[PDB]
Amino acid sequence: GGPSVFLFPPKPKDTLMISRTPEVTCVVVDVSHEDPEVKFNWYVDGVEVHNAKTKPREEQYDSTYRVVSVLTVLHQDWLNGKEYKCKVSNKALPAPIEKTISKAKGQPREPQVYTLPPSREEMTKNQVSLTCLVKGFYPSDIAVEWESNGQPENNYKTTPPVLDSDGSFFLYSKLTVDKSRWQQGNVFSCSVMHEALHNHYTQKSLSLS
């Protein structure tokens, strides 16, 4: 019946592209209305840093408080495997709560990416499903997307990562499209982002090949 801490890692795409801003997020929920102050302490690989920011309190419609501190991290810092220790302390907790996080420990492995067109059998339907297999990559932090003529493809679900026989991972990403398009000749591309790829980005094509 006190505060609980949650520490989330940066978004897969955020660490892979310098363009992006990789952030680490520490959340503090159930902060006694009585004593609503939270003190965050950030340690990068043991060393305490300070450039963290804390987004304003938010009355947890049950009068408790929700407090969040966001720490910007350097890409090559997270990819190089440093640990992020977020120490949260509050006037109502004996000792502070600590939660550390980091990139999965393991030798990175490049993801082969193959595109597979819809089954003839599936053509009886009006909607068709395009398949993008992405096997043999480590760690599992990866981003898979679809686009057609530049513009991104909306309708698509990706199966979570699955641990393959050889310590590696893999998954599929199913982009659904009006058969109409698939038959016309439109071209769709599956793009994959992961640190073990050249430029952290490969892109494979798929159409009425």
Q: Which residues bind a copy of itself (CB under 8 A)?
A: 112, 114-119, 121-122, 125, 129, 131, 133, 135, 155, 157-160, 162-165, 170-172, 174, 176, 204
- The secondary structure of 99-114 as a DSSP string is EEE-SPSS--BPPEEE
Task: Give 19 or 165: the residue with its C-beta nearer to a copy of itself.
Answer: 165
CB of residue 156 to a copy of itself, shortest distance in Å: 9
CB of residue 163 to a copy of itself, shortest distance in Å: 8
Whole-angstrom Cα distance, residue 38 to residue 32?
A: 10
Rg (CA), the chain: 22
CB of residue 133 to a copy of itself, shortest distance in Å: 6
Task: Give 18 or 163: the residue with its C-beta nearer to a copy of itself.
Answer: 163
Q: What is the largest CA-CA distance in the chain?
A: 67
Helix (H, G, I), strand (E, B) or coil at 189: strand
CB of residue 34 to a copy of itself, shortest distance in Å: 27
Whole-angstrom Cα distance, residue 167 to residue 114?
A: 20
